[PDB]
């Protein structure tokens, strides 16, 4: 009964167990005559048998099945608008996977299935190359070149049934746009088989805002045309009468709080059956009812369309269950961070009641830390009890840190060999470590900041900072005072509200100024509470030890943070020396940036960014010249030189040069300028008032796949810097720097595209009220951080 010559030649080439031991012919072959669905078409047909001839006896055995060559990783050459990511599931779903050989008759199952993947455009007959491989064996590679069958151009879009409105208003209200203007990029003719559910839902809600509750189609839709250049759209809208929405009565007890829901559900008499208001009134069970203890409410409302008196009313229901208590909170995914670093930005703890405004308040505070970006809410209910629900938050645990020696820009502060070894957030304890050892053309600023954001229970932060400036002010478009400074300060911040960031803390400040040029603006500070410096030479050393007390306040009502569209950012910064230090002064600085949008999609925002500041001595003394305010280039008033707005420098005529150079911005020299000597070098002032209006209208350059990076803006700046202790009666023939002078204003264009080598802040401006001594610049960019 068992045939001995079932094994053939060449069958043990690739598979010796999947093509030889996958048949019941050995050890248990019972049927011999009607062997049609027992051996060849029962289990062996799935493996490698796709032939037609039945296995007969040995006297007429001429089967001789040859093993077909296998298939390798087929590289799809000629990728015409198709990627290799989505072109992967067409081989094992309906076809032959790797390992098993192509039997040269199931290739139609491989072929039919590639044209059934192109459903975004509607190619029902795609030119797929069904050819034979020239090479015989040894991991052959098929030839699969995909091409386009038809085009993707639409002819026209027409609408009928305009009984109350016009025709051209509905094109701009939809997502269809076939015209490109001179101020945008979009407006091309593109069709999609998945966008039909996007433009039709806004059509029904548009006419539902006019009282037409009987808005329905006449049993027809858009015919499916898979790009035959013969498309034809027809939407026959029907409208009725503008009804009037009456008052909404409360039917049933809404969890014992039905008396507080009537004052918001009731509307003014004379309002129509609005379409966008009935959607925004069914979610009113979470602002005051779902915040008590309820997690999963069920409230329905049916429309009572009464065409007799044109009065439509609605009845509310409630299908609430139990009190929906809260159980223990699980935190999964904390690999690189600890569990205690994220348990305080929640505002919803265990053994309490679930609030609707207690979950998203902790979700927006867990995402603003910057440790991860994938934050979700998995409110899983226990199957044992209908109460004591569990909440599970999602994390991502992304990395942070920076080390690199990226050179900066070259137009404001010169070449910057910024080292910047930014050792970021630590091993999980939540410690904002920061080191920035930069080196610009005029400074060598280094930092070491260790900030603990939660030193106390609720929100108090304690963090120190060590700095060492050692900056040379001759290269910062100033005159003199090459200053070598260092110090150490701590800051204990006390938040008083959800948006206020009041801070306090002491700090030591050391200063060592040398090579100071004799001038009237800075020697008035040295004359007050100090010795008379040597006017015969340079190198006038002056050491200063301070123990100032720093305070501040920050109002950060903002929505996005990176590119803000609505909100205000107020920041205050002040300091005052304690009695016991060297000098006695105080200074305050007020920053204000308000984003006001004038549209609904948050793309047309007016930015009223202002800037203030004031500082003076504490009676009988003067504010030091190394703490003055500066209005300069692309930080306060875009369109001028770096630190040029303010009072200029008038020098003292003496022979105080070291090796007697030609000028060195000093009178009484070999040139002969003895009396009435002045210059145009800014020295800063006691006060500063800078205001700027800005428009954030978008750019007509990039509208293809990204729009949240390029931020083209138009602005109009304004600024002035004056001194408060300048004598107006002692010095004649000089411009009086003792009053708020003429405002220096400018305007131009801006750009805030983020580059991979740091954020690029480009701002080209043109000065409008440039005066004497104020040098102006045009191209002011900023790259490298």
């Amino acid at each position: 009964f068992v045939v001995k010559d079932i094994h053939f030649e060449g069958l043990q080439r690739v598979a010796v167990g999947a093509a030889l031991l996958s048949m019941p012919v050995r050890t248990g072959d019972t049927v011999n005559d009607e062997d049609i669905s027992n051996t060849i078409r029962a289990l062996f047909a799935t493996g490698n048998f796709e032939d037609v001839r039945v296995l007969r006896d040995g006297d007429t055995l001429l089967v001789q099945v040859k093993e077909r060559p296998t298939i390798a990783s087929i590289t799809f050459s000629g990728n015409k608008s198709v990627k290799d990511d989505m072109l992967k599931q067409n081989l094992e779903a309906s076809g032959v996977r790797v390992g098993e050989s192509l039997d040269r008759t199931t290739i139609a199952d491989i072929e039919k299935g590639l044209e059934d993947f192109y459903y975004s455009v509607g190619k029902y007959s795609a030119s797929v190359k069904a050819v034979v491989t020239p090479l015989p064996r040894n991991r052959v590679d098929l030839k699969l070149v995909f091409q386009e069958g038809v085009s993707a151009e639409i002819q026209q879009i027409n609408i009928v049934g305009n009984h109350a409105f016009t025709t051209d208003e509905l094109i701009s209200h939809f997502q269809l746009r076939d015209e490109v203007p001179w101020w945008n990029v979009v407006g091309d003719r593109k069709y999609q088989k998945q966008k039909l559910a996007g433009d039709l839902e806004t059509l029904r809600s548009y006419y539902l805002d006019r009282g037409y509750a009987r808005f329905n189609i006449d049993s027809t839709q858009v015919s499916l045309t898979p790009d035959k250049k013969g498309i034809y759209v027809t939407v026959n809208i029907t409208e009725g009468d503008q009804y009037k929405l009456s008052g909404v009565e409360v039917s049933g007890n809404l969890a014992g709080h039905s008396a507080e829901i009537e004052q918001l559900t009731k509307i003014e008499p004379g309002e129509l059956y609005n379409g966008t208001k009935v959607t925004k009134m069914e979610d009113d069970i979470k602002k005051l009812l779902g915040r008590y203890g309820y997690a999963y409410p069920r409230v329905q409302s049916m429309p009572e369309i009464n065409d007799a008196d044109k009065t439509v009313k609605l009845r509310v229901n409630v299908d609430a269950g139990n009190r929906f208590y809260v159980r223990k909170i699980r935190f999964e995914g904390n690999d690189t961070s600890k569990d205690a670093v994220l348990r305080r930005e929640m505002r919803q703890m265990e053994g309490a009641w679930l609030g609707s405004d207690l979950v998203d308040q902790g979700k927006e505070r867990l995402n603003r830390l910057g440790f991860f970006e994938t934050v979700d809410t998995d409110t899983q209910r226990v199957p044992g009890s209908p109460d004591q629900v569990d909440v599970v938050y999602k994390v991502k645990e992304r990395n942070t840190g920076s080390f690199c020696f990226g050179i900066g820009y070259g137009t404001e502060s010169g070449v910057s060999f910024q080292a910047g070894v930014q050792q970021d957030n630590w091993l999980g304890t939540g410690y904002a470590v920061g080191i920035n050892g930069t080196k610009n053309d005029y400074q060598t600023y280094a930092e070491l900041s260790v900030t603990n954001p939660y030193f106390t229970v609720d929100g108090v932060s304690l963090g120190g900072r060590l700095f060492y400036n050692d900056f040379q002010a001759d290269d910062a478009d100033l005159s003199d005072y090459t200053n070598k400074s260092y110090g150490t300060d701590v800051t204990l911040g006390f938040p008083i509200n959800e948006y206020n960031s009041l801070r306090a803390g002491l700090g030591y400040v050391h200063n060592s100024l040398s090579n100071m040029q004799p001038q009237v603006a800075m020697w008035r500070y040295l004359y007050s509470m100090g010795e008379h410096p040597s006017t015969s030479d340079q190198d006038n050393s002056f050491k200063t030890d301070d123990f100032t007390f720093n305070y501040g306040w920050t109002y950060n009502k903002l929505d996005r943070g990176y590119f803000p569209t609505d909100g205000s950012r107020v920041n205050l910064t002040g300091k005052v020396t304690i009695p016991g230090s060297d000098n006695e002064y105080y200074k305050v600085t007020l920053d204000t940036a308000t984003y006001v949008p004038i549209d609904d999609d948050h793309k047309w925002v007016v930015l009223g960014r202002t800037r203030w500041g004031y500082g003076d001595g504490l009676g009988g003394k003067e504010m030091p010249f190394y703490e003055n305010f500066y209005a300069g280039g692309s930080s306060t008033v875009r369109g001028f030189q770096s630190n040029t707005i303010g009072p200029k420098a008038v020098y003292f005529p003496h022979q105080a040069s070291n090796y007697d150079p030609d000028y060195d911005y000093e009178c009484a020299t070999q040139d002969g300028a003895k009396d009435l000597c002045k210059s145009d070098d800014a020295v800063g002032g006691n006060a500063m008032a800078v205001a700027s209006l800005e428009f954030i209208t978008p750019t007509p350059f990039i509208s293809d796949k990204y729009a949240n990076s390029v931020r083209t803006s138009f602005f109009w700046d304004m600024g002035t810097v004056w001194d408060t202790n300048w004598d107006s009666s002692q010095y004649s023939g000089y411009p009086d720097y003792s009053d708020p002078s003429n405002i220096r204003m400018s305007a131009g264009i801006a750009l805030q595209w983020m580059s991979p080598l740091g954020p690029l802040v480009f701002s080209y401006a043109q000065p409008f009220k440039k005066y004497d001594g104020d040098k102006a610049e045009q191209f002011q960019f900023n790259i490298g951080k």
Partner: protein, 213 residues
């Protein structure tokens, strides 16, 4: 050839350094997966993903021996090695010598190393590799016991007296012989004394009686 790999089967990586015999394992499986001499090298995908410290990558082939070979004599033997590839994800090399306690972290990788050890002692009463797990499960017992203790430590720091008493009772039902229950007992009397309920607080009032440690 089946003899070109068995001739160097005694020459493992004790003489070569890194990459002399790694690619020699992927030789016979690409030609025939049902050979008499090739069956020992085709089912070695769980070590080439494990040797290069790719611990989440090697976890995709742990469920292989359950479906194809249920009558193997080493089913009781492969239930121990599942904890070796899961406890490496529990503790990291960064917090190894820095003195950082890894108990206040995600215990998800500790339960994956526990579910195979739980079926090992309940599935077979007399196994062959169990006494090495007794020194290994005592490290997994005290690791996820100090996790809920740190949650109970934080709730006393905020003032949540109801939230802390639900965590210590979560440590009172499935932690009989760990170290974290010795310090969680003063956390019970602190929450009960701050609350007005004092019907049972006198029974849990005394803590330090004889255990002076």
């Amino acid at each position: 050839p089946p003899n070109e790999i068995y001739a160097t089967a005694q020459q493992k990586l004790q003489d070569g350094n890194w990459r002399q015999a790694i690619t020699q394992l992927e030789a016979l499986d690409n030609r025939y997966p049902f050979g008499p001499y090739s069956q020992q090298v085709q089912l070695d995908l769980i070590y080439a993903y494990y040797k290069n410290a790719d611990l989440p990558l090697a976890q995709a082939a742990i469920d292989r021996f359950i479906r194809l070979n249920p009558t193997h004599p080493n089913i009781d033997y492969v239930m121990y090695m599942r904890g070796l590839t899961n406890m490496a994800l529990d503790d990291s090399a960064l917090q190894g010598f820095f003195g950082v306690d890894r108990s206040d972290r995600d215990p998800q990788h500790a339960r994956a190393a526990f579910s195979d050890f739980s079926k090992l002692v309940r599935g077979y009463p007399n196994s062959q590799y169990t006494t090495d797990a007794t020194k290994r499960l005592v490290f997994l017992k005290d690791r996820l016991a100090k996790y809920e203790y740190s949650v109970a430590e934080y709730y006393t720091e905020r003032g949540a007296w109801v939230a802390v008493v639900n965590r210590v009772e979560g440590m009172l039902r499935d932690y009989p012989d760990t170290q974290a229950t010795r310090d969680a007992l003063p956390l019970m009397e602190n929450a009960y004394r701050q609350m007005q309920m004092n019907a049972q607080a006198e029974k849990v009032a005394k803590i330090i009686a004889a255990n002076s440690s």
